[PDB]
Design an enzyme around this catalytic site. Structure first.
Site, PDB file in Angstrom:
ATOM      1  CG  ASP A 215     -97.260  -5.331  -4.810  1.00  0.00           C
ATOM      2  OD1 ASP A 215     -96.951  -5.719  -5.859  1.00  0.00           O
ATOM      3  OD2 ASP A 215     -98.169  -4.856  -4.505  1.00  0.00           O
TER       4      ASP A 215
ATOM      5  CE  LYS B 145    -100.489   1.283 -10.485  1.00  0.00           C
ATOM      6  NZ  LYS B 145    -100.659   0.027  -9.810  1.00  0.00           N
TER       7      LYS B 145
ATOM      8  CG  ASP C   2    -104.646  -4.601  -8.534  1.00  0.00           C
ATOM      9  OD1 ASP C   2    -104.054  -3.610  -8.646  1.00  0.00           O
ATOM     10  OD2 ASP C   2    -104.299  -5.768  -8.305  1.00  0.00           O
TER      11      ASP C   2
ATOM     12  CD  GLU D 238    -100.790  -1.142  -6.568  1.00  0.00           C
ATOM     13  OE1 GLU D 238     -99.682  -1.408  -6.606  1.00  0.00           O
ATOM     14  OE2 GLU D 238    -101.499  -0.300  -7.342  1.00  0.00           O
TER      15      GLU D 238
HETATM   16  K   LIG Z   1     -96.561  -3.557  -7.569  1.00  0.00           K
HETATM   17 MG   LIG Z   2    -100.151  -4.967  -8.303  1.00  0.00          MG
END
Ligand SMILES: [K+]
Ligand SMILES: [Mg+2]
Ligand SMILES: *P(=O)(O)OC[C@H]1O[C@@H](n2cnc3c(N)ncnc32)[C@H](O)[C@@H]1O
Ligand SMILES: [K+]
Ligand SMILES: [K+]
Ligand SMILES: [Mg+2]
Lengths: 523, 340
Positions: free
Chosen positions: A198, A70, A8, A175
């Site tokens: 998420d 990111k 992750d 994800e």
């Molecule tokens: K997320």
């Molecule tokens: Mg995450």
């Protein structure tokens, strides 16, 4: 291949797991932490810090502490989202090749300009070292997760970060799909529709999956790659910068130490307000040797972020509409991300689903790495994994710009991948020797309202009158969700085929090799 | 592929449960992960056969056996579908043959038939040039051939392609259709010399001396073209070829000529004319492949490249039925009744 790890690569926090002896092990870092801050720092002594060490010295060395990479990868310089984040980032962000690069003092006077891919590569290196210490051997192969709503450039940038960290990225996994595996692996209950919500440090995904004794089928996905914890922190930071301006007449932005000191305390206060109804923000020597003392109520925190919190419901309605499913057809709501601990987020989700409680099967911080590790186990081929099958989709409609700035759609959003689509096009003028193939991501009928994936130069079209040549352009989305563009003259032609070259607006193989080599000198 | 095997295993489980939509999705995933997965092609064939799609089932068993000729399950399955597909394909030829007779049944004093045949001529030229990307309209083509005046602001090449096709079709209908005896290479060259003569007088009526590409197809080297054309025309005049149903013969003749692609250009136009020469010599009307069918046309040609020409034969049969349906619809007489 050796031992394939699941990573992750999070906006704020990263996590690594390995599938070994039948089950997933989430691996603690050198500090004993099962999650690692997505942070790098260069000390004045020329020392490169990654993880907890880098985050821990943010307030004393903010200019040379890097994070939020990111939210920089796969974006242009003038992206309003990039310009938004710059206002709250302490490190220099410079325009290089119309993309945001990171300039830092690496030590002893000299500076260095980094691609955001290089910062993420450092974070991947730290997660790899974490795995290697635990495994007691070298790690060369990984599954790396990305937001479901990541565009083509953001996906390739994540693969490039893998390459620069000396990892073979065997698979990019969405994800929410990773989290779905963490939820569904131990479930032998037959067909269920699950809504994965998420909300992370940086990106927000909603994915509706049908899970069924090893089959993980994404029915619909919709999200925002620039909505998460970072935005909630920015809203609170801005509130207190204005409040301090109001009370003292002093501008906090004149000091990066002050701004990032506020960020650190805002973080602690946000976590506190998920179990408490108020939090005290205390900073010693905040600005010009003067102390900062304020209270943040849960009510105020909610007010400052209410538009952003409410906005998380739009993708939930979108996946339901796209799937043509009712709220009642959802068997489980699966909350992923630290941000889903925010009581107002839980309240909005529960109320949207007319009182339905979300499931408690998963760790919201570790679920994504858990799923990555399981898929890493499958691709390893030697781990006694079951008949695990992911049927994932592309998040964005892919099209080509045609005459008049028209979005000619080839692959709709929510198409199962891998996939292939071909369409025949022709020239706009006599003897036109080239197609400027402009590929767009988005749902709008005109390309100016969509996002440019890339420009592909197609050359070698034989001379012919306007609209005569029959040039088939093919879009292929691979199992990583990444696009390949090919083309073919459908008519009888000479041996010397038409050729396609990409735009040079993404890292070239030469640029990647250099960054690989540069990274090896800290490995 | 371990991923392919997992998808196939899940496909079979979902089929057993009756989750056929999910089974189909998993079969297609398995074959994306491994396009040459013999077990997946075979099982996906059985799935097709359960939905009473015998042609598709048979296509998949046949594709499986071209990869793995001794595959026991594929052999047993193909051996079952082989006669069922022959029955289906022959039944379609019978329906086409009935409609050919219905065209021939049209009274000799039908005004609509002469109108429709003339219109059908210009329609054939339109579609055969437009397939290759020619942008001239039906009305522009009618104008070029009737008035012999250039349409203003349209390319010389496109107009010369239309003139060539007219020249070629006149030559065929006046010299070849009615003629007794074998169809020679020289006949094919005379057709091509008219097809390409007004555009490219140098290449018109002679084999290419260079390597060409035809979409995804790589035709034989120019040095092998003479020999392949001699084998081709020997087959054209063979007892075996004349025992085939005219639609299969015409379709195979089309495919074999574009496979060889003996000319630098005009292989498609020439092959469609040869197909219609064969049909008309057998007493069938000339057929048109419509420009809108172009993608289907390339798709079945690609399937033939991969070793099954039957999708191409069935495509030509469907074009034949459509041509016949168009003639019959246009020549329908609507009876007048006495109230009485
Ligand atoms: K997320
Ligand atoms: Mg995450
Ligand atoms: P050239 O422009 O002379 O001829 C074009 C014709 O070639 C045929 N064709 C297209 N694509 C294929 C493939 N894949 N295999 C064999 N033949 C092919 C069509 O008849 C075109 O009209
Ligand atoms: K946003
Ligand atoms: K934002
Ligand atoms: Mg041509």
């Amino acid at each position: 291949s050796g031992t394939v790890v699941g990573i992750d690569l999070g906006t704020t926090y990263s996590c690594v797991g390995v599938f070994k002896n039948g089950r997933v092990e989430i691996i603690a870092n050198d500090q004993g932490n099962r999650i690692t801050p997505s942070y790098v720092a260069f000390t004045p002594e020329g020392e490169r810090l990654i993880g907890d060490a880098a985050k821990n010295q943010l307030t004393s060395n903010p200019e040379n502490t890097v994070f939020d990479a990111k939210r920089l990868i796969g974006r242009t310089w003038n992206d309003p989202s990039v310009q938004q984040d710059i206002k709250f980032l302490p490190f220099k962000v410079v325009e290089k090749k119309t993309k945001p690069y990171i300039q830092v003092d690496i030590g002893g006077g000299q500076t260095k300009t980094f691609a955001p891919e290089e910062i993420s590569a450092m974070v991947l290196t730290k997660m790899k070292e974490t795995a290697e210490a635990y495994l007691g051997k070298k790690v060369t192969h990984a599954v790396v997760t990305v937001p479901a709503y990541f565009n083509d450039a953001q996906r390739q940038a994540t693969k490039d970060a893998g390459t620069i960290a000396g990892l073979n990225v065997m698979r990019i996994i969405n994800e929410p799909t990773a989290a779905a595996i963490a939820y569904g692996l131990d479930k032998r209950e037959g067909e269920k529709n699950i809504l994965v919500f998420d909300l992370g440090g940086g990106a927000f995904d909603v994915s509706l999956l049908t899970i069924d004794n090893g089959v993980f089928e994404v029915v619909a996905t919709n999200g925002d790659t620039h909505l998460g914890g970072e935005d909630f922190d920015q809203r609170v930071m801005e509130h207190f910068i204005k409040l301090y301006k109001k009370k003292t007449g002093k501008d906090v932005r004149k000091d990066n130490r002050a701004v990032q000191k506020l960020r650190r305390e805002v973080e602690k206060a946000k976590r506190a307000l998920s179990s408490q109804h108020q939090a005290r923000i205390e900073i010693e020597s905040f600005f010009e040797g003067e102390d900062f003392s304020e209270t943040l109520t849960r009510a105020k925190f909610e007010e400052l972020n209410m538009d952003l919190f409410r906005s998380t419901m739009k993708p939930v309605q979108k996946v339901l509409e796209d799937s043509d499913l009712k709220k009642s057809d959802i068997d489980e709501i699966v909350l992923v991300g630290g941000s889903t601990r925010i009581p107002k987020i839980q309240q909005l989700v529960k109320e949207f689903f007319n009182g339905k409680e979300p499931s408690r099967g998963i760790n919201p911080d570790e679920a994504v790495a858990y799923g990555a590790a399981v898929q890493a186990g499958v691709l390893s081929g030697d781990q006694d994994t079951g008949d695990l099958v992911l049927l994932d989709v592309c998040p964005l409609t892919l099209g080509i710009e045609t005459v008049g700035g028209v979005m000619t759609k080839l692959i709709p959003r929510n198409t199962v991948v891998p996939t292939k689509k071909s369409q025949i096009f022709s020239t706009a003028s006599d003897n036109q020797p080239t197609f400027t193939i402009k590929v767009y991501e988005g749902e709008r009928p005109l390309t100016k309202d969509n996002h440019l994936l890339g420009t592909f130069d197609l050359t070698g079209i034989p001379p012919a009158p306007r609209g005569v040549p029959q040039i088939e352009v093919t879009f292929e989305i691979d199992v990583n969700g990444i696009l390949r563009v090919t083309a073919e003259d459908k008519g009888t032609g000479n041996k010397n085929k038409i050729t396609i070259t990409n735009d040079q607006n993404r890292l070239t193989p030469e640029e990647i090799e250099r960054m690989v080599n540069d990274a090896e000198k800290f490995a | 592929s371990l991923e392919a095997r997992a998808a196939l295993n899940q496909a079979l489980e979902m089929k057993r449960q009756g989750k056929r939509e999910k089974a189909q999705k998993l079969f297609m995933h398995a074959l994306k992960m491994d396009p040459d997965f013999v077990d997946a092609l075979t099982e996906f064939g059985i799935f097709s056969e359960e939905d009473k799609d015998i042609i598709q089932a048979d296509y998949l068993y046949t594709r499986a056996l071209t990869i793995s000729p001794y595959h026991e399950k594929a052999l047993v399955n193909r051996d079952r579908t082989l006669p069922l597909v022959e029955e289906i394909d022959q039944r379609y030829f019978s329906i086409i043959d009935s409609k050919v007779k219905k065209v021939m049944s049209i009274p000799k004093g039908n005004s609509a038939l002469r109108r429709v045949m003339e219109e059908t001529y210009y329609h054939h030229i339109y579609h055969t040039v437009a397939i290759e990307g020619n942008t001239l309209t039906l009305s522009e083509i009618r104008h070029i051939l009737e008035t012999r005046y250039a349409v203003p602001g349209k390319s010389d090449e496109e107009q010369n392609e239309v003139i060539g096709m007219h020249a070629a079709m006149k030559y065929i209908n006046t010299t070849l259709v009615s003629r007794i005896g074998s169809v020679t290479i020289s006949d094919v060259l005379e057709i091509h010399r008219r097809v390409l003569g007004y555009v490219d007088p140098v290449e018109a009526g002679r084999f290419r001396t260079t390597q060409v590409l035809v979409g995804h197809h790589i035709p034989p080297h120019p040095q092998d073209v003479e020999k392949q054309m001699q084998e081709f025309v020997q087959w054209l005049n063979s007892e075996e070829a004349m025992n085939l149903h005219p639609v299969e013969f015409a379709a195979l003749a089309h495919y074999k000529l574009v496979y060889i692609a003996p000319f630098i250009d005009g292989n498609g136009r020439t092959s469609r004319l040869l197909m219609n020469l064969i049909l008309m010599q057998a007493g069938y009307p000339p057929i048109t492949i419509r420009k809108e069918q172009r993608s289907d046309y390339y798709h079945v040609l690609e399937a033939a490249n991969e070793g099954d020409v039957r999708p191409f034969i069935r495509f030509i049969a469907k074009c034949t039925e459509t041509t016949l349906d168009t003639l019959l619809f246009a020549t329908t007489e609507y009876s007048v009744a006495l109230p009485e």
